[PDB]
């Protein structure tokens, strides 16, 4: 096998924790939708994750700007939001349900996003004809050839049962 170099690695890695990643997390996926859903076709519809390394950075680079926007505009209710949900044990969503609207007081308004209630995480979509459709999959080597058939004509026994003497 052949692998890509030590370059095309070492990208700007999102160094955050688990709860602050799960903090927004809901507004996140339902509004980018160009690099990531197409990346699934780059992984499901064709395998071998050694070919598919461009859109692994397309999902990553836009996610770098998602948190860069939320830091400049509104981070004062954000940091206290994942504060209370990090008060741990399973990370429930019914404890900080009170303090969720103080974060989303302006995310719908200031920078103008939406709340994707339950329509997300289903409803299989299409993207666009982006790469050439990978026919001839992973090997698809040979069939091989089958055994030929007989249709013929059904005529009875040639002289009858032919066993030892046994005429009819």
């Amino acid at each position: 096998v052949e692998l890509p170099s030590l370059e095309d690695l070492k990208v700007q890695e999102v160094k955050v924790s688990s709860s602050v990643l799960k903090a927004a997390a809901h507004h996140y996926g339902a509004q980018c939708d160009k690099p990531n859903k197409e990346f699934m076709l780059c992984r499901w519809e064709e395998k071998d994750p050694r070919r598919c390394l461009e859109e692994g950075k397309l999902v990553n680079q836009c996610a770098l700007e998602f948190f860069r926007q939320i830091k400049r505009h509104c981070a004062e209710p954000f940091t206290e939001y994942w504060t209370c949900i990090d008060y741990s044990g399973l990370q429930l969503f019914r404890r900080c349900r009170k303090q969720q609207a103080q974060f989303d007081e302006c995310v719908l308004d200031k920078l103008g996003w939406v709340r994707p209630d339950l329509g997300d995480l289903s409803k299989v979509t299409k993207v666009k004809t982006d790469r050439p459709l990978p026919e001839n999959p992973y090997h698809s080597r040979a069939r091989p050839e089958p055994n030929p058939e007989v249709e013929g004509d059904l005529k009875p026994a040639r002289h009858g049962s032919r066993l030892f003497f046994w005429t009819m």
Binding site: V150, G152, K155, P156, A157, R158, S161, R162
Partner: peptide
């Protein structure tokens, strides 16, 4: 009488090819 009739029917085809 069927089973001999299906016996010779498959032999003659493999004779033919």
């Amino acid at each position: 009488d069927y089973m001999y009739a299906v016996r010779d029917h498959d032999m003659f085809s493999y004779i033919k090819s």
